[PDB]
Design an enzyme around this catalytic site. Structure first.
Site, PDB file in Angstrom:
ATOM      1  N   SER A   1     -11.529  11.084  -4.285  1.00 42.45           N
ATOM      2  CA  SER A   1     -11.087  10.716  -2.937  1.00 42.45           C
ATOM      3  C   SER A   1      -9.579  10.530  -2.903  1.00 42.45           C
ATOM      4  CB  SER A   1     -11.760   9.428  -2.469  1.00 42.45           C
ATOM      5  OG  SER A   1     -11.379   8.336  -3.291  1.00 42.45           O
TER       6      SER A   1
ATOM      7  N   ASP B   1     -11.972   8.967  -8.538  1.00 45.02           N
ATOM      8  CA  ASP B   1     -13.257   9.468  -8.015  1.00 45.02           C
ATOM      9  C   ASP B   1     -13.125  10.754  -7.185  1.00 45.02           C
ATOM     10  OD1 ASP B   1     -12.416   8.618  -5.480  1.00 45.02           O
ATOM     11  OD2 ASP B   1     -14.027   7.181  -5.176  1.00 45.02           O
TER      12      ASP B   1
ATOM     13  N   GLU C   1       0.802  -1.205   0.000  1.00 44.27           N
ATOM     14  CA  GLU C   1       0.000   0.000   0.000  1.00 44.27           C
ATOM     15  C   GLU C   1       0.852   1.280   0.000  1.00 44.27           C
ATOM     16  OE1 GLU C   1      -3.107   0.367  -0.650  1.00 44.27           O
ATOM     17  OE2 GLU C   1      -3.928  -1.633  -0.326  1.00 44.27           O
TER      18      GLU C   1
ATOM     19  N   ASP D   1      -6.299   8.398  -0.670  1.00 44.57           N
ATOM     20  CA  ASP D   1      -5.847   7.350   0.272  1.00 44.57           C
ATOM     21  C   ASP D   1      -4.704   7.911   1.090  1.00 44.57           C
ATOM     22  OD1 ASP D   1      -7.593   5.592  -1.023  1.00 44.57           O
ATOM     23  OD2 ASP D   1      -6.017   4.781  -2.315  1.00 44.57           O
TER      24      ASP D   1
ATOM     25  N   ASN E   1      -9.061   5.314   2.792  1.00 46.54           N
ATOM     26  CA  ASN E   1      -9.709   6.147   1.791  1.00 46.54           C
ATOM     27  C   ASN E   1     -10.668   7.178   2.425  1.00 46.54           C
ATOM     28  OD1 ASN E   1     -11.793   6.673  -0.508  1.00 46.54           O
ATOM     29  ND2 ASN E   1     -10.182   5.500  -1.502  1.00 46.54           N
TER      30      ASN E   1
ATOM     31  N   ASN F   1      -7.307   9.176  -5.915  1.00 42.77           N
ATOM     32  CA  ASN F   1      -8.066   8.238  -6.758  1.00 42.77           C
ATOM     33  C   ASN F   1      -8.813   9.041  -7.810  1.00 42.77           C
ATOM     34  OD1 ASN F   1      -7.452   5.958  -4.943  1.00 42.77           O
ATOM     35  ND2 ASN F   1      -8.763   7.075  -3.513  1.00 42.77           N
TER      36      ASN F   1
END
Ligand code: NA
Length: 129
Positions: free
Chosen positions: A50, A48, A35, A52, A59, A46
């Site tokens: 959002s 969309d 990760e 992380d 998220n 991301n």
């Protein structure tokens, strides 16, 4: 902060992740490796809109507040910035909520694709715990 492998295993064990919801410590170490490369300050936007955050790339669509993810929730009741600290408390406590939510560690795409079904014990071998 960039943790060493065994450094993070020990920290994760102190914060209560070893066997949490039946996931052995090596699962959590493997997930963090893929990760974030063990970097607590990792961020990834991301498509969309959002973002992380942190060593487990938690998220903002569901789990933390960053003020710039419209129509999102903050189920861990934290600012997303808390997930970037050298102190892994907020990331661990939020990860505990996530893994309890129904899909287990499948919530982490990197875990499903790169750790699930592998010999995850290798990630904690040679470590003092
Ligand atoms: Na949010």
């Amino acid at each position: 902060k960039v943790f060493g492998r065994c450094e993070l295993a020990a920290a994760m064990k102190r914060h209560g992740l070893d066997n949490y919801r039946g996931y052995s410590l090596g699962n959590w170490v493997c997930a963090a490796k893929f990760e974030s490369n063990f970097n607590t300050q990792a961020t990834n936007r991301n498509t969309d809109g959002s973002t992380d955050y942190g060593i487990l790339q938690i998220n903002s669509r569901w789990w933390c507040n960053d003020g710039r993810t419209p129509g999102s929730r903050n189920l861990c009741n934290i600012p997303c910035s808390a997930l970037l600290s050298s102190d892994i408390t907020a990331s661990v406590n939020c990860a505990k909520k996530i893994v309890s939510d129904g899909n287990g560690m499948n919530a982490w795409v990197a875990w499903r694709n790169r750790c699930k079904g592998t010999d995850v014990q290798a990630w904690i071998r040679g470590c003092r715990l």
